[PDB]
Amino acid sequence: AQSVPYGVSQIKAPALHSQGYTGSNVKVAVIDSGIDSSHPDLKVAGGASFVPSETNPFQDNNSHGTHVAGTVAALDNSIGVLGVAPSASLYAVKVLGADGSGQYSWIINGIEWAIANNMDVINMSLGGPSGSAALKAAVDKAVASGVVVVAAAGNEGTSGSSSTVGYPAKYPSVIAVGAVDSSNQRASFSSVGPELDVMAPGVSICSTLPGNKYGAYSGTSMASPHVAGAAALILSKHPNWTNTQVRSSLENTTTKLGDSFYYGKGLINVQAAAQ
Ligand SMILES: [Ca+2]
């Protein structure tokens, strides 16, 4: 039978699924280590691989990409888990390899592909301690072109009085997502900083793994897809919304939790955000 992970319920997504808003016709890109399409609980529309050593984007040799994909769009049916946007057209943009590592040229090319193939939402459950003029530009270009770009704040914890949010999450154009547990307490690994925007569930997140499996992972990497899915649910109710309206709606309707340096605007509530 099907189990709804606590996270999907915490951001109040099932309220919209019941209104008939499941994210149908919204295209979301999982810029990651590819997505295993043979999972009975996932429906991958297309994608591309920018990893030179790994040509099949529908092959995830790591486990990370599939997991992230399931939190966004695991199918609403009688098996496994449920995503935030179960009817979303999932796109596997493989920019990371089997060891989970990827080069910025690969990531940047993955973001570029997402723009020309008109993705409504881009999800980047990845990041680094350094930027690039090409990375800044790739993500800014996506936003200028109406794409909602979501990214994990990073898993660097606190650092005195400084920001530990990595890139591309550190950029003003990118929605940097941190992690909260079930009780709404910031996960100690979640990056902090003035660049944090919202928080989404990220501790012990149950989702899809390669080869008809389900397993839990903890990270801001698992936080990100709840906000990516949430942006897709909002878009299915209001298809006329610009990426800017999806964003301000998501940040202005949050549940305030603590100081913005550690919580951003707070926990996203997609029910209040969709309006
Ligand atoms: Ca399912």
**Does 64 qualify as catalytic in the annotation?**
yes
Q: What's the token pair of residue 112?
A: 């570029």
Instruction: Name the residue among 36, 33, 47, 27 with its Cα closest to residue 229.
Output: 27
d(CA 256, CA 267): 7
**Residue 239: burial class (beta carbons within 10 Å; 0-12, 13-18, 19+):** exposed
Which experimental approach was used here? X-ray
Got the DSSP string for 50-61?
-BTTB--TT--S
Q: From the candidates 17, 39, 64, 226, which is the catalytic residue?
A: 64
Tell me the angle at which helices 243-252 and 220-237 cross, rounded to the nearest 10 degrees. Answer: 120
Residue 227 in contact with residue 200, Cβ under 8 Å? yes
Domain count, the chain: 1
d(CA 162, CA 261): 9
- CATH code, 228: 3.40.50.200
Q: From the candidates 17, 32, 87, 249, which is the catalytic residue?
A: 32
**Does 197 qualify as catalytic in the annotation?**
no
Report how far ligand 1's centroid is from the alpha carbon of 70 (Å): 9
**Domain of 252, in residue numbers:** 1-275
Q: What's the token pair of residue 265?
A: 């605007």
Q: What's the token pair of residue 241?
A: 């919304």
- The amino acid that residue 160 corresponds to is G
Distance of CA 58 to the CA centre of its chain: 18
Q: From the candidates 221, 224, 236, 249, which is the catalytic residue?
A: 221
d(CA 46, CA 98): 20
